[PDB]
Amino acid sequence: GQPWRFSSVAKMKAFNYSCYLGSSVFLESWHEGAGLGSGLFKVSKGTTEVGDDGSVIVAADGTRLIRVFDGPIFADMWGALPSSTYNSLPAIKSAYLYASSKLQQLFLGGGSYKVTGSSGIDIDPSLAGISALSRARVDTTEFTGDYLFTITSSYSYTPAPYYNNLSVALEGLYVFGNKTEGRSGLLTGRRTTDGVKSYNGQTEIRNCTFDKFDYNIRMGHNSWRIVFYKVNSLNALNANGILYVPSGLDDSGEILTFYHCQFFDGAGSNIRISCSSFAMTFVSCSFLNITFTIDAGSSVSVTALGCNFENPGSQSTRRYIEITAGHTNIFNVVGGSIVTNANAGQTQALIHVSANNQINLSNLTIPYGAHYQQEADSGYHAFCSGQGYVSTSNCSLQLLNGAGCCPIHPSLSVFTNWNLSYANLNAWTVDKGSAPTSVAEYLSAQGPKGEGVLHVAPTTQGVNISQVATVSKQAGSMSMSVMVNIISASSNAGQISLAYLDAFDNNLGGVSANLGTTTGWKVIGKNTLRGRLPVGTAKVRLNIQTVAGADVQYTNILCNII
Amino acid sequence: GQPWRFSSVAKMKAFNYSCYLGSSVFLESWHEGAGLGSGLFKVSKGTTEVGDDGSVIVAADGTRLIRVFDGPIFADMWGALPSSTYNSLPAIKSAYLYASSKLQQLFLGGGSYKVTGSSGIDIDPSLAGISALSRARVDTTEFTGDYLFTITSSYSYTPAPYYNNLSVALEGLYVFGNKTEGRSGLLTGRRTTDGVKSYNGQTEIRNCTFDKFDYNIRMGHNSWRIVFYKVNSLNALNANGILYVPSGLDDSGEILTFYHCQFFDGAGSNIRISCSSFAMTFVSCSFLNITFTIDAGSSVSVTALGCNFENPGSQSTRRYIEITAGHTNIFNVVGGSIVTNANAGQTQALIHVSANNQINLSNLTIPYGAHYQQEADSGYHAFCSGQGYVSTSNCSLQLLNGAGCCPIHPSLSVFTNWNLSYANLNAWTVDKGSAPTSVAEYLSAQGPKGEGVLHVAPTTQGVNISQVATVSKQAGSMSMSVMVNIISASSNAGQISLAYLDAFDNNLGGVSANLGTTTGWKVIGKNTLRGRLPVGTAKVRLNIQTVAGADVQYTNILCNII
Amino acid sequence: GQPWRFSSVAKMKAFNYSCYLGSSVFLESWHEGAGLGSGLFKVSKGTTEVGDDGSVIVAADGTRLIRVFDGPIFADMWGALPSSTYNSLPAIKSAYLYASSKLQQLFLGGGSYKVTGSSGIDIDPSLAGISALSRARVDTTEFTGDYLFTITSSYSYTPAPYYNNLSVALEGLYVFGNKTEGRSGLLTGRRTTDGVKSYNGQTEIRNCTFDKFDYNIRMGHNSWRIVFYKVNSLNALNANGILYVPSGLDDSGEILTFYHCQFFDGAGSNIRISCSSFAMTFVSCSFLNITFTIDAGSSVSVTALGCNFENPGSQSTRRYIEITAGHTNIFNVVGGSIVTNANAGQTQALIHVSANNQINLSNLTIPYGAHYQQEADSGYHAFCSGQGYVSTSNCSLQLLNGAGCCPIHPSLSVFTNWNLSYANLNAWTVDKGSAPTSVAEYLSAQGPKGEGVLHVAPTTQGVNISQVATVSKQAGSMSMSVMVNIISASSNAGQISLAYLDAFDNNLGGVSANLGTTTGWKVIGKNTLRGRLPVGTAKVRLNIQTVAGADVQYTNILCNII
């Protein structure tokens, strides 16, 4: 006795089983003409159950047909089909709720899906997932709600660590969306603090794409570790909408990871980290056109191994990474090339440290271009700004490259008195040859940003300003940069020199630059002052000379080794 | 002619094919009522083969039914069904043995399995695997044996490197177990040295969980590279049972890797590494409540990028990482936050180096708490102990944080004579103002642990002890710590000061502390002696002062920059 | 009405549907006896379409049978079967072309495949892939063509970033091949510069194996990021055939990554990187018997975290990593053990830097053996060579180990004048006790490679040559190495000493060596001159002594700390 065949589920429901003596029936498709989700049912003929659609379906007569499952469970089996104007959220929700019992893995079919409603999907990593192998796409333009996907675990501590990482939680989902207020994408954890303390560890989210949301990815309470494997979010609505963490989080943030992640195409959108005791790692990921901002009350540690910072096409002057306000937090970049393309000026500092915060760079190369003009906004011409402290080791700082190179941060200055903060002539040796009365005094409260300026007014003879510093870590780079203002110019009043000496005061070489003629506050150190120290150097001597007549003034006279 | 239908395999075996003229038959399920593993057979009717259950099954008459395979091969097809009291090991073994021929991938069905017997499973990475997508769970409580899973390759060199990494060896397996002697989990390689030198490279083990075993994971002979992708083992029986490597291994240990691995919930269990020329890498993994111990005869190199060390809830005083005994081996932590929670005292050193061994830390932050009391066990109050050497670069060493901060290791002390090992008053400048006869001599064989103490007994005038050291790497942290004993106290005999000077001996600032009144061996340097060096500092001056009257003694007078 | 059954596709084509009134038909296998790729068709009976084989097949009568698809799409369904002499390339090409429409994922069946023809496969990451779960193997010995696999995306910018990483592009493929000119394997991007600028980002290539090709993997135009997850290529035809990048690439090379990759068994084959602004990262991968060569016009940045360099069995003297010619590029090794096995001499430098190029090493151990003889080819006995600059931090440089240890690179020498490049007696203090006329002058244009030699000819009294240097980073290693030539030998004219001093000139220890008797240019510093600096050392003093009578000469007198 071969089983009966049904073209559509409506026909199966219509047919009465009073006189039908059969063990099983076979449906070719749940929808007429779709040809998807074929299934095998067995008639119970007397028992009563919940009566779901995909499983234990109910007919008009009353008998319920129990589905038999072979291999993986498909979510399109219930009611889901690829379309552009057919709702499929109830079918997916019912399939996931059924898969929660006798926990297994839930798979989505191919094609573009459409979902609408007012409720999101509660993904439990310890129970099931929405993993889709064949590049599933869902549409959420018509859908309205706070969150489409929220990931949390109901189990407190007993079964969650035992079986949480056996399979991924969400794979192969491309979500559409529109730019409206109050509608976001995926939340990790729980939106509310009350309830049971969730334990969702080792939860995977791989090969998924979110876009056109107010908050692409948001971190909630009790989401301490998550593995994002190659996820990219783009085109957020407002600033800080790509990856958000509220400051009111509790007991969360234990070594989150990103594996070849990406954040790009940010039309006025940022990424903000604001939490206490929050650890994050990036491995071999590049995010571009994104301003990575950090303002946390307590220590937040973010590390980046092989992270690429760039901007392929943009005329904006946004800065790459900044720390706005914090007590003490760290930023780590290891072995990731940084490249800046052409722009119509920058007038900004690419990376910013404030208060007591620190960024550490290692195995890095520092690019330079002819369109930085960093000195316009933050005084000294350098690659950084702010009162924070920057420590770097083994950085390349490529030499040559047309215009030249620039210092990274003034905190690495070998000279103890560069910005004239000592309020006197300390640490600077002045020599007025032959006739006295040459003016080389120091006045304060006048400068590009308020720092003191050390002007020299020599008459009928030159004056020499010399200082000696000690080098560290053997060979390095010089990366000179000095702000120079010339109130009166009659000739080439230049000849600013830097010399290398060994431990026994023997000359090994040097570089010299000439002060220009323009009146405005120029920068000297773009070229003809860079180089690599000869092997065996011990000390660096700075000399500043002015010819008789024209009087000048200098500021931010700083070296920056390696 | 539609094929015949069979509800159960027993019915198919019973039915005689003498008068049956058919090409194929269809079974709905191998077990009656299970509804799993439906299959299609074709009758051979005359040929003779081995007569396995899943493939080329044999009937009572004698004819053998050859199974036809479409798509992937399912292991539950043979005899396996999800249950709690039904044995399934023979079915899995037969399925894997059949999959070894015409090598393919073997998939397990969903649900909780049960296995028992006395033999383990020999997984050959170059032939097949036990990859299970839908979160397969097996039970091994009733099972007895040396090893449930042993991974090795029979091929020597010809076909093994060619096709070994094409697919994973074991995926989606959660194993149960009980705490009994002699029963362990997964072994990599061969348990015996004799035989053919196996070549099992690029073998994957992903999304699997082991627990309640004597040895959760053990490494055997000829297991030189293995990729553990998000594996966690917990609740071992004895110490060192989570990840074991015997010292008798040969030609093994070439750059093993762990990707977001985990070791936690260790109830008196450790992880031990003891091998010669053994390389291991950790990437973005956190193991907690685990004492990572290393005692190897020769060089063992373990690196950790983004590794988190912590203890969420525990009152134990266990130490995180230790090197017990070795010739010369290295430990590497890069960009992984270390956090210590509240405890009722520590009385131990969190990380330990012995003999000539070294740990290197970089891009790290050093936490501090008010419940360390590290000075109780290993003399000086510091974050380390032992005769080993510790080198760190770019470490954060957060400042402030309530009580303060502590030095990491004494080997970074800038002062050449801190523990009074010179057996004299060298490197210390003593000044007894006005009247002589003030006693500041040095006596040995008396101290907290046996090191010498430099006591001062000044009368009717104070005595000053001064030393000068040179700073490196520009700005850093101070992290003062000194053991102080006061035999007699009459007033505030304090005023221990530290001052910063530039290259030209100009004052830039300083920090001072006051010696207490309690008789016992206190520590000074928890607070009011920490700070960040001003930009441009060159030298650090240490001054120790004692008021006339009370006599004191100091030990472990050490600075620790960065 | 049960559907009709067809054993073979030829029988289905032969049967006429004029009088057949049926809705669907079922084929057991496309080939007779194969028993693979069973499928369900529905008769259109009047419509006209393209008439492909796997989909919408066409019969002899004229009616076309539309296939119905359930779950994933299988590529073996069209015409592919595992064999050794049956062509399957047209079937795979047709299956991929059909899968491009209504984009989904394409899966290959098990068994060894055979492909032949003259055209390659155009894999579009944004459309479909050739992912094969069950270890698919294809044979390309008979196949002839420029490239078997070429990966590129036709989309410019609109839909490519939106949906590119949803699934892998190629998984589980083992390709065979023969060593012939003009036949290679997988190319990324486009072979020609003209056309549309492709955007193929986040494209995965995992668990695949290539061998016996002229160019195993080649990078083409517009291939800026690719994720190679555990790929290994071996046995290339010519040199530089394992992983090739032409110098004519445009707008490509943004942070490429390798995850546990491998390159081994290279029979006269190399890996060459030649491109401008090219970023590459290696994570936990080991490549052996491969000479990693870099010669790029502009800055190329390659980083390696946990990379293992070794040679299990080989008598060759090839060098591990070299930079032939470049402006300024960087090489980064972090936390990856380097081990060298036994050999019948080396006579070469293992790692090579040229011109202004730099390699940075960190968290590394430097092995040593008794069969290096590095001084034979490149003058000084060291672990490096060339005019480039090497910077290292936190390196282990294991001590002891039989013969001893060797310096890494001369650019870290603490002495300013080691190779006698000053053309005089500067930086060297000479003391001729008692009688003058002892000869210690310097002559040039004579030496092992042309550098000057400082010979001493003392009579009736010894002469002492002393120098003082400053130590950095506190404790380190010495790693002495000096070339010594003895023209005349009458006794033990040795006693070359190195001493440690603190900041106040107090002895802390030292190491001494004795010059031999052999006439030839020997090396001194293999043993009895290594050690770890005591805690608190500040200066290192070098002393060279010669007894009266025999006259000697020294060259490359260099220390190398850490």
Query: What DSSP letter does each residue of C265-322 carry, written as one string?
Result: --SS--EEE--SSEEEEEES-EE-S--EEE--SS-EEEEEES-BB--SS------SEE
Residues of A with Cβ-Cβ distance to B112 under 8 angstroms = none
Contacts of residue A472 in chain B, CB cutoff 8 Å? 472-474
Alpha helices in A478-532 (DSSP H): none
* Cβ partners under 8 Å of residue C298, min gap 6: C276, C277, C326, C327, C328, C329
User: Helix (H, G, I), strand (E, B), or coil: what is residue B460?
Assistant: coil
Q: Residue C428: which residues within 8 A CB-CB, separation 6 or more?
A: C417, C454, C465, C466, C467
Which string of DSSP letters, residue by residue, matches C435-456?
S---B--EE-S-SSSS--EEEE
Answer yes or no: do A472 and C469 touch at CB < 8 A: no
Q: What is chain C's alpha carbon radius of gyration, rounded to the nearest angstrom?
A: 34
User: What are the respective helix, strand and coil percentages of chain C, to the nearest 5?
Assistant: 5, 30, 65
Beta strand C351-352 pairing with C321-323: parallel
List, in sequence order, every residue forming a beta bridge with C96; answer none if it has no partner.
Answer: none
Which among C294, C286, C382 has a CA at the least distance from the CA of C335?
C286
**How many CB atoms are closer than 10 A to CB C324?**
15
Backbone angles phi, psi at A446, to 5 degrees: -140, 125
C-alpha span between B204 and B226 (Å, rounded): 6
Decide: C260 and C281 in contact? Cβ < 8 Å: no
CB pair distance less than 8 Å for B207 and A166: yes
Please answer yes or no on whether A209 and C162 come within 8 Å at the CB atom.
yes
Q: For the residues of C150-206, what is the DSSP string, one character each?
A: EE-----SSSTTTSSSSS-SEESEEE-----TT-EEEEESBSSSSS------SEEEE
C-alpha to C-alpha distance for A524 and A504, rounded to whole angstroms: 30
Q: Searching chain C, which residue's CA lies closest to the CA of residue A532? A: C356
- Spatial CA neighbour of A542 closest among A442, A407, A418: A418
Distance CA A306, CA A321 (A): 15
For C412, the closest of A137, A394, A474 (CB atoms) is A474
Is the distance from CB of C547 to CB of C510 less than 8 angstroms? no
* Chains in contact with chain A (at least 3 beta-carbon pairs closer than 8 A): B, C
Element (H or E) spanning A292, and its range? Answer: strand A292-294
Q: Where are the beta strands (DSSP E) in A94-167?
A: 106-107, 121-123, 136-138, 147-151
What is the rounded distance in angstroms from the CA atom of residue B156 to the CA atom of residue C477?
A: 41
Which of C69, C330, C468 is facing A396, going by the closest CB pair?
C330
Could you tell me how many CB contacts below 8 A there are between chain A and chain B?
A: 171
Tell me how far the alpha carbon of residue A20 is from its chain's centroid. Answer: 64
For residues C517 and C492, give the distance between their C-alpha atoms in angstroms, rounded to a whole number.
7
- Residue where the block lists tokens 């007549």: A549
Q: Which two tokens stand for residue A162?
A: 């035992």
| Closest to C365 (Cα-Cα) out of B530, B86, A76, B302 | B302
Neighbours of B421 (CB within 10 A): 14
CB C540 within 8 Å of CB C503: no
CB < 8 Å to A260, chain C: 202, 227, 257
Q: Which of A550, A554, A553 is nearest to A460 (CA)?
A: A550
Residues from chain B contacting residue A427 (CB–CB below 8 Å): 502-504, 506, 536
What are the residues facing B107 on neighbouring strands? B74
Cα separation values, B142 from B176, B213, C458, Å: 10, 13, 86
CA–CA dist C500, C539 (Å, integer): 6
- B154 burial (CB, 10 Å; 0-12 / 13-18 / 19+) is middle
Tokens of A523: 């920068």
How close does chain C come to B261, measured CA to CA in Å? 14
Select from C4, C43, C162, C539 the residue whose CB has the most chain A CBs within 10 Å, as the one to mutate to test that interface. C162
Smallest CA-to-CA distance from B118 within B148, B139, B156, B141 is with B148
Beta pairing, strands A481-486 & A552-558: antiparallel
Give the Cα separation of B477 and B534 in Å (integer): 10
With an 8 Å Cβ cutoff, is C208 touching chain B? yes
On whether the CB atoms of residues B120 and B147 are closer than 8 A, the answer is yes
DSSP secondary structure code for residue C13 in this structure: H
**β-bridge partners, B431:** B464
Map out the domains of chain B as residue ranges.
Answer: 4-68, 72-248, 270-412, 429-558
C-alpha triplet A99, A101, A104: angle, nearest 5°: 50
B2 touches chain A (CB under 8 A): yes
Residue type for A303, please? Answer: T
Question: What is the C-alpha to C-alpha distance for residues A479 and A485, in angstroms, rounded to an integer?
Answer: 20
Q: Which two tokens stand for residue B421?
A: 């090992």
Residues shown for chain C: 562
A100 touching chain B per CB within 8 A = no
* Residue from B258, B379, B390, B267 nearest B318 by CA: B267
Half-sphere CA count of B381, side-chain side, radius 13 A = 25
> Tokens 């050739």 map to which residue?
C130
Distance CA C131, CA C207 (A): 9
Give the DSSP per-residue string, B422-451. Answer: TSSSTT-EEEE-SS---B--EE-S-SSSS-
Q: Return the amino acid letter for B539.
A: K
Contact C165, A209 (CB under 8 A): yes
Experimental technique for the deposited model: cryo-EM
CA distance B191 to A398: 53
d(CA A161, CA B231): 11
Query: Which chain A residues in 3-22 lie under 8 Å from chain C, judged by CB atoms?
Result: 5, 7
In chain A, which residues have their Cβ closer than 8 Å to the Cβ of C468? 503
d(CA B206, CA B196): 27
Rounded Cα distance, A332 and A281, in Å? 9
Report the CATH superfamily, name and number, of domain A429-558: Galactose-binding domain-like (2.60.120.260)
Beta bridge partners of B293: B272, B322
Q: Which two tokens stand for residue B455?
A: 């006591």
At which residue do the structure tokens 């003016």 appear? A439
Cα dist from A555 to A405, A446, A548, B280, whole Å: 19, 11, 20, 51
Whether C35 contacts C77, CB under 8 Å: no
**C31 touches B: beta carbon within 8 Å:** no
Query: Using CA atoms, how far apart are residues B459 and A162, in angstroms rounded to an integer?
Result: 69
Q: How far apart are the first and last CA of chain B?
A: 85
Strand ranges for B62-179 from DSSP E: 64-68, 73-74, 106-107, 121-123, 136-138, 147-151, 170-171, 173-175
Contact A322, A292 (CB under 8 A): yes
- With CB atoms and an 8 Å threshold, state whether C104 touches A2: no
Structure tokens at B49: 């083969």
End-to-end CA distance of chain A: 85
Contact yes or no for C208/C170 (Cβ under 8 A): yes
Residue length of chain B: 562
**Contact, C408 vs C560, CB < 8 A?**
yes
Distance of CA A75 to the CA centre of its chain: 34
Amino acid at B222: N
Closest CA to B545 of B478, B510, B501, B498: B498
User: For chain C, first and last CA: distance in Å?
Assistant: 85
Residues in chain C followed by a break, C to N above 2.5 angstroms: none
Tokens of B173: 């397996």
C245, two tokens: 């990048």
Structure tokens belonging to residue B518: 């309690």
For A518, phi and psi rounded to 5 degrees?
-65, 145
Structure-token pair, residue C289: 């018997």
State the Cα–Cα distance between residues A482 and A454, nearest whole angstrom. 12
Documented resolution in Å:
3.8
Contacts of C213 (CB under 8 A, 6+ apart): C175, C177, C183, C184, C185, C233, C236, C237, C241
Sign of CA dihedral A303, A309, A314, A317: positive
B400 chain-A contacts, CB cut-off 8 A: 327-328
| CA separation for the pair B488, C371 (Å, rounded) | 65
CA C490/CA C496 separation, integer angstroms: 17
Retrieve residue B264's tokens. 């936690």
- Those of residues 40-69 in B touching chain A at CB distance below 8 A are none
Chain C, 159 to 178: residues with Cβ < 8 Å from chain A are: 161-163, 165-167
Residues paired with A122 in a beta bridge: A150
What secondary structure letter does DSSP report for A221? Answer: B
Tokens 């690429």 label which residue? A308
**Which residues are bridge partners to A244 per DSSP?**
A218
Task: Identify the bridge partners of residue B26 per DSSP, sorted by sequence position.
Answer: B5, B40
- HSE-up (13 A, CA, CB side) for residue C109: 28
Residue pair B228/B259 in contact by the 8 Å Cβ criterion:
yes
Please identify which residue in the block is written with the tokens 């210390």.
Answer: B428
Is the dihedral angle over the CA atoms B412, B418, B419, B425 positive or is it negative? positive
Q: How close B451 gets to chain C, by Cα (Å)? A: 16
The angle formed by the CA atoms of residues C42, C47 and C49, to the nearest 5 degrees, is: 90
Residues 6+ apart with CB under 8 A from B494: B513, B514, B515, B516, B545
Name A408's Cβ contacts closer than 8 Å, sequence gap at least 6: A361, A366, A382, A383, A384, A390, A392, A395, A397, A479, A560
Cβ–Cβ gap B230/A72 under 8 Å: no
Using DSSP's 3-state secondary structure scheme, residue A362 falls into strand
| Residues A290 and A309 sit within 8 Å (Cβ to Cβ) | no
Length of chain A: 562
Residue A92 three-state SS? helix
- Minimum-distance CB partner of B74 among A71, A102, A279: A71
Q: What residues are paired with C293 via a beta bridge?
A: C272, C322
- Would you state the structure tokens that stand for residue C395, as one six-digit string? 């390196």
Cβ atoms of B46 and B37 closer than 8 Å: no
- CA-closest candidate to residue A225, choices A248, A192, A202: A202
Number of Cβ within 10 Å of residue B441's Cβ equals 11
Which tokens hold the place of B147?
């090893």
What is the rounded CA–CA span in Å between residue B455 and residue B499?
23
Residue-wise burial string across A485-506, b where 16 or more C-beta atoms lie within 10 A, e elsewhere: bbeebeeebbbbbbbbbbbeeb
The DSSP line for B56-81 is SEE-SSS-EEEEE--SSEEGGGTT--
HEC string of B355-394 equals CCCEEEEECCCCCCCCCCCHHHCCCCCCCCCCCCEEEEEC
Cβ distance of A415 and B536 shorter than 8 Å: yes
d(CA C13, CA C9): 6
Dist. CA C341–CA C339, nearest whole Å? 7
Contact B172, C245 (CB under 8 A): no
Contact yes or no for A162 and B334 at CB 8 A: no
Report which of B418, B415, B362 is spatially closest to residue B390, judged by C-alpha positions: B362
Residues 6+ apart with CB under 8 A from B512: B495, B496, B497, B498, B528, B529
Tokens of C526: 């293999």
Q: Which residues of A touch B257 (CB under 8 A)?
A: none
H helix or E strand, kind and range, residue A96? helix A89-100
**Which of C257, C393, C427 lies closest to A260 in CB terms?**
C257
Main-chain phi, psi angles of A379, to 5 degrees: 70, -105
Adjacent-strand bridge partners of C486: C552
Please give the Cα distance from B234 to A165 (Å, whole number). 14
Answer yes or no: do B227 and C232 touch at CB < 8 A.
no
State the Cα–Cα distance between residues A380 and A387, nearest whole angstrom.
13
Residue of C nearest to B252 (CA): C312
The partner residues of B259 in beta bridges, in order of sequence, read B229, B283
B499 neighbors B462 (Cβ within 8 angstroms):
no
- Answer whether A115's CB lies under 8 Å from A85's CB: no
User: Which residues 403-462 on chain A approach chain C with CB closer than 8 angstroms?
Assistant: none
> Cα(B444)–Cα(B424) distance, rounded to whole angstroms?
10
**Three-class SS of residue C404?**
coil
A157 touches chain B (CB under 8 A): no
How far apart CA C528 and CA C404 sit, in angstroms, is 8
Estimate to the nearest angstrom the gap between the alpha carbon of B154 and the chain centroid: 30
The residue among A507, A523, A530, A516 whose CA lies nearest residue A557 is: A523
Interfacial C residues in 322-341 facing A (CB < 8 Å): 327-328, 330, 332, 334
Q: Determine contact, residues B430/B448, Cβ cutoff 8 Å.
A: no
